[PDB]
Amino acid sequence: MKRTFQPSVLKRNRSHGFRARMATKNGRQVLARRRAKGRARLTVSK
Template sequence: MRRTLEGTKIKRQHVSGFRARMATPGGREVLNRRRAKGRHRLAIQAKKRA
């Protein structure tokens, strides 16, 4: 039996990635808020493959 919710990396990038945030006025607000707060990571980042 499968779990009911399984995320996908592609979907996550398309919704929450840096370029997705930059594409809309609301997303840019999110980034600016995170910059103002001093967040080390502004948006999620794909993990580097070894």
């Protein structure tokens, strides 16, 4: 039947994209934690 993941790149980027993370203090904290962990991909990008 209809599953929970229904893709949309616009909604993906608006909700979880780099700029969305940079827009709030807590989102810049997500990027900082991920950078300290040494993550290859900080966000889903192009």
